[PDB]
Design an enzyme around this catalytic site. Sequence first.
Site, PDB file in Angstrom:
ATOM      1  N   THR C   1     112.334  85.870  23.238  1.00 20.06           N
ATOM      2  CA  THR C   1     112.766  84.628  24.221  1.00 20.06           C
ATOM      3  C   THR C   1     114.243  84.434  24.097  1.00 20.06           C
ATOM      4  O   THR C   1     115.103  84.477  22.985  1.00 20.06           O
ATOM      5  CB  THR C   1     112.145  83.338  23.414  1.00 20.06           C
ATOM      6  OG1 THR C   1     110.899  83.256  23.354  1.00 20.06           O
ATOM      7  CG2 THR C   1     112.648  82.060  24.191  1.00 20.06           C
ATOM      8  N   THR C   2     114.753  84.475  25.174  1.00 22.47           N
ATOM      9  CA  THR C   2     116.346  83.964  25.340  1.00 22.47           C
ATOM     10  C   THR C   2     116.646  83.250  26.597  1.00 22.47           C
ATOM     11  O   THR C   2     116.018  83.532  27.588  1.00 22.47           O
ATOM     12  CB  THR C   2     116.908  85.541  25.524  1.00 22.47           C
ATOM     13  OG1 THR C   2     116.616  86.564  24.590  1.00 22.47           O
ATOM     14  CG2 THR C   2     118.209  85.508  25.504  1.00 22.47           C
TER      15      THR C   2
END
Lengths: 215, 201, 191, 228, 238, 213, 240
Positions: C1-2
């Site tokens: 997740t970014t």
Amino acid sequence: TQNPMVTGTSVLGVKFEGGVVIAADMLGSYGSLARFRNISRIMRVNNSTMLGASGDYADFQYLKQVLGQMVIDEELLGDGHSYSPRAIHSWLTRAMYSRRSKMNPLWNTMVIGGYADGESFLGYVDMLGVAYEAPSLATGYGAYLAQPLLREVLEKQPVLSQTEARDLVERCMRVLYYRDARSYNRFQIATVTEKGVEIEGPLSTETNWDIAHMI
Amino acid sequence: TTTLAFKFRHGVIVAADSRATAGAYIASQTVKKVIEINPYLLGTMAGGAADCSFWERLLARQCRIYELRNKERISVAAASKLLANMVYQYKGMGLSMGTMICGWDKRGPGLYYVDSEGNRISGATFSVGSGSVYAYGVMDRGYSYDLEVEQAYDLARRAIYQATYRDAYSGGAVNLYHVREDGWIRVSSDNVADLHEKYSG
Amino acid sequence: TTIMAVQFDGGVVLGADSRTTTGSYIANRVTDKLTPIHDRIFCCRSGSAADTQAVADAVTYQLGFHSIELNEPPLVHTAASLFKEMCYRYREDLMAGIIIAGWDPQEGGQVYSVPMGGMMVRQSFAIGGSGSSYIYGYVDATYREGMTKEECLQFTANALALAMERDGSSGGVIRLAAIAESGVERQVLLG
Amino acid sequence: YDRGVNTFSPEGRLFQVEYAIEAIKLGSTAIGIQTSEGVCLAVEKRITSPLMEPSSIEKIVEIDAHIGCAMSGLIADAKTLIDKARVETQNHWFTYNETMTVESVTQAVSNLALQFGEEDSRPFGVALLFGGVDEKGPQLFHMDPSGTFVQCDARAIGSASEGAQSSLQEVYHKSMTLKEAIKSSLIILKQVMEEKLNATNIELATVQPGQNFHMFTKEELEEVIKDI
Amino acid sequence: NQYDNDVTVWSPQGRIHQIEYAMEAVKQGSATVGLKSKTHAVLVALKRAQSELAAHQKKILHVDNHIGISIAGLTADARLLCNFMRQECLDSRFVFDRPLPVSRLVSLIGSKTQIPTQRYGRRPYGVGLLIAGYDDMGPHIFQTCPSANYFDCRAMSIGARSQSARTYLERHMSEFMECNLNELVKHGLRALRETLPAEQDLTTKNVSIGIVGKDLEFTIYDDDDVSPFLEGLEERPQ
Amino acid sequence: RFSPYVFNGGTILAIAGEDFAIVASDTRLSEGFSIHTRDSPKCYKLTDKTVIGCSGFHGDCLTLTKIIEARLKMYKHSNNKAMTTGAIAAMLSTILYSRRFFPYYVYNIIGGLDEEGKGAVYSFDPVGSYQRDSFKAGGSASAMLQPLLDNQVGFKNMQNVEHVPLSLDRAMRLVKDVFISAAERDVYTGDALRICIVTKEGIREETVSLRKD
Amino acid sequence: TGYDLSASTFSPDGRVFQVEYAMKAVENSSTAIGIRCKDGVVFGVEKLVLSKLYEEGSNKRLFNVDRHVGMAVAGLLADARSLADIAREEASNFRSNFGYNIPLKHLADRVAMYVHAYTLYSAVRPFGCSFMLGSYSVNDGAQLYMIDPSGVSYGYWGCAIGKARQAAKTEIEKLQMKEMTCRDIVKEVAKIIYIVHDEVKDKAFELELSWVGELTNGRHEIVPKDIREEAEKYAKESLK
């Protein structure tokens, strides 16, 4: 608070003739990551007293919110009374002691500086409700690092002028930059006088690295 | 810590030591371990200092109100029962209490034993403490129901002396109370170092 | 997740991957990590999935009720204040990585950061998530004050693609959003 | 107007507590005298039947071993105030290892003499006399259903209140003795009661400094009567 | 008269009569007089006997080391507000470690007595407080009322026939800011003697004097130390 | 994780005289291997005839002192007199037992005059059991001070030594000598010595320096 | 009449007289006016001395709710004090929950709903107060509000509360307030108070002027009229 997520570091403070000077850096480290490298850790309470803190920063914004309301609530009365810096030191002690007794503490360590009625004031507040007064204070690793530099001068000379005291902090802030893994080369200096509370900008240090050429 | 109590023809004898320790460190040598509840009741202090001191003082607060309402002293079996119910509400929370209740009653002498666990029992002889088992041997060899008054004084004074000799957590002075029909009376209080010269000859 | 957020002169630019994983298995291959709150304020969420979905619905309920009373468009700082109240109070219970960004009539574009602790701070640009540590030194050597909108869409696209290439919990597809005074321009990109 | 304690008169006043003072007036008389040698105390029994057991009628109760009591008015209200006043001295000894003073007893008693509508019931129907020997010597006090607490040197309440107080101011002075004031008291009693005074109509109670025991007289009272 | 039953019911003229009646309960108590100099605030009250040999009921009572109050009206509401008064003073000592400002203590009393003047089920407090104090800005004399309208004042007298004391104070209020501790007290007890019928005199056994000073803790005098104050007086001008 | 206690050091001494009482303590406030301050006396003047000392965890020492001073005023407005020395010792035992299942980490010694004008010393424990003694030493250096005062004051283990009562001037040099010997061997002791003397004429204070290491 | 005891009952024509009765208790209070200029709001209170022992600034009717909001109450003074503490407490919760200063349009809504709740139940009575609300902001300008005892709240340019409610706004409306600066307003408020009833049936009064706007940088405070004394120097010129 059981786990401090975003933490600060050491805060210095020392009395002088007619005022108290306090310095701290501008870093919001998360473990080892220096994640938030532009934040303010010194709050200007009304005109005489003044607060800096260490430990968890989200808890610091909570006390910044609550103390901000109490000062407004007295000024609206207009009866000519204000909170003395010793009164803030009394109130903040009872807030921390009541909070640990529920086993849900506030992860901070706070330094209160104030100048009222021709008298300087410099107070300490622990997470566990341990509080005292001293002519020089230091939190964090600064209690191990910068504190012997403060006490050697005050025993050899009990009173200090403003230029002597402000120069002495910049030496101690330099030494904390060399040997603290959570330090940062950008700090600010706040000072109370009888003229009020004044906060200087993002100052920096000057380092020496001539021993690197040695083997 | 060593206490003992026994009843015989002429009332009840209570005796105890006076040493209080803290780990391997002796706090004091002059601890009064026999708590004077009333002019007609006596309680001991065996296991826990502030626990035995508080709840027996709270019992003395209770028996006085009973006397003012009913115009009559409380019985010994009643005062033992009230202390047993107060402690039982805090069962498992870590109280230490092993006292004994002594006193003359309308039924005669009275001797009850009360734990922090809820062991309300009566009996004739008891001995509570760390050096309690050193007292059961020398007392039961010399015990009789038809002992004299001065003989029973020498029995309890000997029994505490043999307990403080072997045990390390018992010493100081040796207190001695006598429960008579009208009320209790203090007998004497002797140091062990004075009893050592008397008993060795 | 970014997750990613950059402000510019007109407004702000948001961006995220998808790849909702569970252990080492991808549960959801494509995921709206960015969420509308009001017509001009988005948030992109990180941490626990079931926690951040529950918080964002409560803030939308409170902020959406709050602006109908005032008959005014809400402030972005007002929306970031509501996430701070729920995260600081219900800390030791939630794992939330909220970044709030959006255009405001009073103040233009703004970007706020609410990490897992519960603090709040305004930044020129803000990143977060598990794979945020990898592009973390790329972003401040590449950032430059005074970008246009099309540069910031190019800036965050190259920024997210490096972590998505690298971090195992990140990747999938790039979802972008540009918020300005005019409208909201959402697009799905791969490259 | 009155009909309820939550209501004022145009002039003051109650009009409810005033009626509570009226309920004292049909009680039995009671006299206590404060004297430096100690506080004596006297009361009239008013026994109805010979089958009626006399010692079940209480007028002097023992609050503590150095403080006596005397009541009039409603017995039903009195037994509540006696019950707390024993507990309040008992808690004070429990947390201070000392005896509560006579003045500070009645402070605890008056604190729910005035609670009747002050919650968040009716006022009580009983007046009290408290005598005791504390560290300031012997003391005598008096209260009312309005909680108005005061110190008196020689007080007489119940019925025949005004008839006693007028006669009682004639004989009192500062330099009395205790044995003088006991026989000074019951002269007033046989003037104001209706029966021939004997050993069954009245009872006494005296507290002394060195004699914290025996707030009572038990058929030595027969000897005091013939010493009239 | 049908509107004259509850605190809740307004009148058709706009005047709630139950508050108007509690004003009359203040006039049942005796008179008391408070005043202040630049440095000393002195309140003097008048005792009243119950019988010839009973003790006189006290009026002035200590609250804190810098605040003492007088009383007029019901003794029920006297100790009821006193216990609320003493509780708030030691909380500022416990929390803030400072004494209270006297002005913001009285605002707590007005908030206290407001609620039983509006909700049904509780009468107003019939009481006549006069308050003397020391905050950081010198002495203060305050009065209250059962209508919860607290007044700052420099001299005041309330109770039975207390108008004659007020007329004395108006023609001497210019003299009060300059005199010392000594005649300030006997400026004050020259005012009580006009609240007396002219046949009896202000003796020792019926008067109390409380003084709080800038360097002086609040002290109550009674029946023996009043004699250094009662000396140096003239008789009544008859 | 979070632990609610910490140790701060300190040493409290009290001696009941024939008509006096002496309470002494050092002024060093430490934690772990650090010195917070060199000026923090543990003496507290409760009344004009009662001085208390508080050691142990310092955050509880500040709380417990402020609870006692509130209840002194609550006694006085309710009873029109000040508390005695024995009444405070009876009150404090109830306060300490009131948190039996989350205790104060404080050692307490109350010294002062009785109602007869003689010295009185009450020692305590963190749960609230007490007794009246003639002399006690509490704190970190308590084990280094009790055996010496048994020799000099109590005259224990001495042969053919008469029992003269302790005068005031002789008791002063006993207090000044026991802390010099204690500051050599204990690390939680030094930097000053605050001494309070309770007589029938008020409370005198006196400060004697110690070694600063 | 005979239907007007509780505030929970209707009249046979459809109104509540307990609200009607409490409105004309405000009518017997002294006059307090309010007026706003193009960059601020100026308050003004005619306040009369009780006897002589008033101490020159006691029991004032100009309150201070927030950093930038204050009141101009008239009616039962003790009832307005408790009502002012509601408004002080209401702005603190908005600060704590939203992080910025309370808008005046929203603050008047929160207070008037609280005033409304005392007009329904039989256990409580309606308030006997009415008051003003003035503020100033750079994003909103100046606003001026007005709350009756019934709870009806909306905005004005000038208003008056007291005996001479009609007799004051007769000559407020002859001012060109849309273009005047508030420093010019202060001497113009002074005559409007001084025109109506100086000492006719009363003895003496004293003037109080509150002051918020751009010149105070958004702060709300009392005027410096101890400075320059220009109110009474200019209001007393209307003797002719």
